[PDB]
Design a protein around this ligand. Structure first.
Ligand SMILES: C[C@H](CO)OC[C@@H](C)OC[C@@H](C)OC[C@@H](C)OC[C@@H](C)OC[C@H](C)OC[C@@H](C)O
Ligand SMILES: C[C@H](C(=O)O)c1cccc(C(=O)c2ccccc2)c1
Ligand SMILES: C[C@H](C(=O)O)c1cccc(C(=O)c2ccccc2)c1
Ligand SMILES: C[C@H](CO)OC[C@@H](C)OC[C@@H](C)O
Ligand SMILES: C[C@H](CO)OC[C@@H](C)OC[C@@H](C)O
Length: 582
């Protein structure tokens, strides 16, 4: 393997190679049209093929970054399409590659992912599968420039499974949509989980992600020994570092090598692996990625005996910190399948901080004897929040619960851009729908782990154009304390309210063309803007002025001439709003 391109082509096979290269280009160049990307893919794939034939062929010895780079720059369009991706080809490797990476956009300016009509969609699918899935991987990857690439391949396969079933049946849409919405929601959660893994590695270092993986894998495979869970964490950290950095072919090859390793060792890892290890490669790794927890081995000693009683606690911590704190996370997490990963990391942090304090005293055991008892308040803190918010979710339902959170978050961090506030509050709402229904003991980990990915999305959206200082502080001070940090924010009483824009409540007629989902987004946008104008208004005053947004909408979109309805109701809403809010 002196030729990388040949080595990856041979390892992943033509079909995945082509998909991974398409995703690679789609993530780096999110604005470029499909045609350009398919050209680059063929050019790279032709080069791959020339090298597999004869490793001595021209460019066969380049790095994958060189090859992607040399194909990108030779392309006619880029400098006109992009201002600052013109900039990058003005560097050499590794600077050139690093540059492309920093331009990845977490919210590229693109219209929503078009879901054509059921028969239309089924027709495209039968017409030309290859073109259909190429467009699919492009449209998702460009909108989610850190999506776990091997998993995006899996989603394309699932999408094909769903189409194959539904497209032939008597009603199309009726079969299709509940499945395509299930799939979309599962893929969005996948993208948000991977975005958190990349942000952990990139902002906080490999160790931030290794501790998170150690905890999760300890809980999933508690019968595995610390050595094996450690080897898996190491390999997984490498896989995610590669995928998060755009080394998609290496990431897919390494992930497939890991799945193969775990299958070849399943007896000593988990009996639950047999489900997965019988499947084809993408289903097999997907299955492993989300596998349900094994049962805890019977007969494990009391966790106090290694971590509080052993005379060598301070010695171990001082002489081999990561090994000893890793063993702490492995032992505590395997014993606690029903804690969120983040709580287990916060307990790991408290245990560490207690050792740091206690081991510098005359009597460390006297100092840290109660360390494990001192966890309970941390355990109990996320409980009260979950119970109060899940009863509010139960009572208000999705739409009003989202509204409630929208008003609460806009008052906490009112400098945040309205689209971000809307998107985050809507996501925080979906945590209610996903989590509140589970038995109480599964609720905590569901909610807490889900809130991590939603807050990380807020942090990554805010990172690029920082506008609020509390968000910068909560996002930058920790990974694991982000949720308590945001929880503790009261209303910002420092923010100067915005004065009243006429232009905020009339969006011409294009609004009349929007599906139900988008109308609600528009209402929610108006709500955020009302809160930014009048942060002290009552919930009922807010609702009223939105109710009157609901009217001016129904009115012009019930009326023959919406435009003339606009002159009559648009300012008049300026008026009725003054009446209601002052
Ligand atoms: C070989 O030793 C084990 C190692 C491979 O596991 C990964 C390593 C990064 O674990 C760090 C962990 C012990 O940090 C604890 C510490 C409270 O966690 C801090 C974290 C939450 O930021
Ligand atoms: C009174 C009620 C409660 O606490 O039981 C409550 C509390 C917070 C929010 C809301 C809303 O649904 C809402 C809807 C639109 C705009 C603003 C608020 C309702
Ligand atoms: C952290 C943040 C805050 O309050 O600062 C917040 C906002 C809304 C809800 C929750 C929840 O715990 C929760 C519980 C059930 C469903 C969805 C969210 C937490
Ligand atoms: O799977 C993706 C394939 C079907 O598309 C390859 C195009 C870009 O040439
Ligand atoms: C191109 C090929 C069509 O048969 O795509 C099928 C879907 C399921 O997968 C996408 C490829 C890239 O793995």
């Amino acid at each position: 393997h002196k030729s990388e391109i040949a080595h990856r082509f041979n390892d992943v096979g033509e079909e995945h190679f082509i998909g991974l290269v398409l995703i690679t280009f789609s993530q780096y160049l999110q604005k470029c049209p499909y045609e350009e990307h398919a050209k680059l893919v063929k050019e790279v794939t032709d080069l791959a093929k020339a090298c597999v034939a004869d490793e001595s062929a021209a460019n066969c010895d380049k790095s994958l970054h060189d090859i992607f780079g040399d194909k990108i720059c030779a392309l006619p369009s880029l400098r006109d399409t992009y201002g600052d991706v013109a900039d990058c080809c003005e560097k050499k490797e590794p600077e050139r590659n690093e540059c492309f990476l920093h331009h990845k956009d977490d919210k590229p300016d693109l219209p929503p992912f078009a879901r054509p009509e059921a028969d239309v969609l089924c027709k495209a699918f039968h017409d030309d599968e290859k073109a259909f899935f190429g467009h699919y991987l492009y449209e998702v990857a460009r909108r989610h420039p850190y999506f776990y690439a091997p998993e995006l391949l899996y989603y394309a396969q699932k999408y094909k499974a769903i189409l194959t079933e539904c497209c032939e049946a008597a009603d199309k849409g009726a079969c299709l949509t509940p499945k395509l919405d299930a799939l979309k929601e599962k893929a969005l959660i996948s993208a948000a989980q991977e975005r958190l893994r990349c942000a952990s590695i990139q902002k906080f270092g490999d160790r931030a992600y290794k501790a998170w993986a150690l905890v999760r894998l300890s809980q999933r495979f508690p019968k595995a020994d610390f050595t094996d869970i450690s080897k898996i964490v190491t390999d997984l950290t490498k896989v995610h570092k590669e995928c998060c950095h755009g080394d998609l072919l290496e990431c897919a090859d390494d992930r497939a090598d890991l799945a193969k390793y775990m299958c070849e060792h399943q007896e000593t890892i988990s009996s639950h692996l047999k489900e997965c290890c019988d499947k084809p490669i993408l289903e097999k790794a997907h299955c492993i990625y989300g596998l349900h927890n094994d049962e805890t081995p019977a007969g494990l000693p009391a966790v106090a005996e290694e971590f509080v009683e052993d005379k060598d606690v301070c010695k171990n911590y001082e002489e081999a910190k990561d090994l000893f704190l890793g063993k702490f996370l492995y032992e505590y997490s395997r014993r606690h399948p029903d804690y969120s990963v983040v709580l287990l990391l916060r307990l790991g942090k408290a245990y560490e901080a207690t050792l740091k304090k206690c081991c510098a005293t005359d009597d460390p055991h006297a100092c840290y004897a109660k360390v494990l008892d001192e966890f309970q308040p941390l355990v109990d803190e996320p409980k009260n929040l979950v119970k109060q918010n899940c009863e509010l979710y139960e009572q208000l339902g999705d739409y009003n619960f989202q509204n409630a959170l929208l008003v609460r978050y806009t008052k906490k961090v009112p400098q945040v851009s309205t689209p971000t506030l809307v998107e985050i509050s809507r996501s925080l709402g979906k945590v209610g729908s996903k989590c509140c229904k589970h038995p109480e003991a599964e609720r905590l980990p569901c909610v807490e782990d889900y809130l991590s990915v939603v807050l990380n999305r807020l942090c990554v959206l805010h990172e690029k154009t920082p506008v609020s200082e509390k968000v910068t502080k909560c996002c930058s001070e920790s990974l694991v304390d982000r949720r308590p940090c945001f929880s503790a924010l009261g209303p910002d009483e420092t923010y100067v309210p915005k004065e009243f824009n006429a232009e905020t409540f009339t969006f011409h007629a294009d609004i009349c063309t929007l599906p139900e989902t988008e109308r609600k987004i528009k209402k929610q946008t108006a709500l955020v803007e009302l809160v930014k104008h009048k942060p002290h208004a009552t919930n009922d005053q807010l609702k009223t002025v939105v109710g009157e947004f609901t009217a001016l909408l129904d009115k012009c979109c019930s009326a023959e001439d919406k435009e003339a309805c606009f002159a009559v109701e648009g300012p008049k809403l300026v008026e009725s709003s003054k009446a209601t809010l002052g």
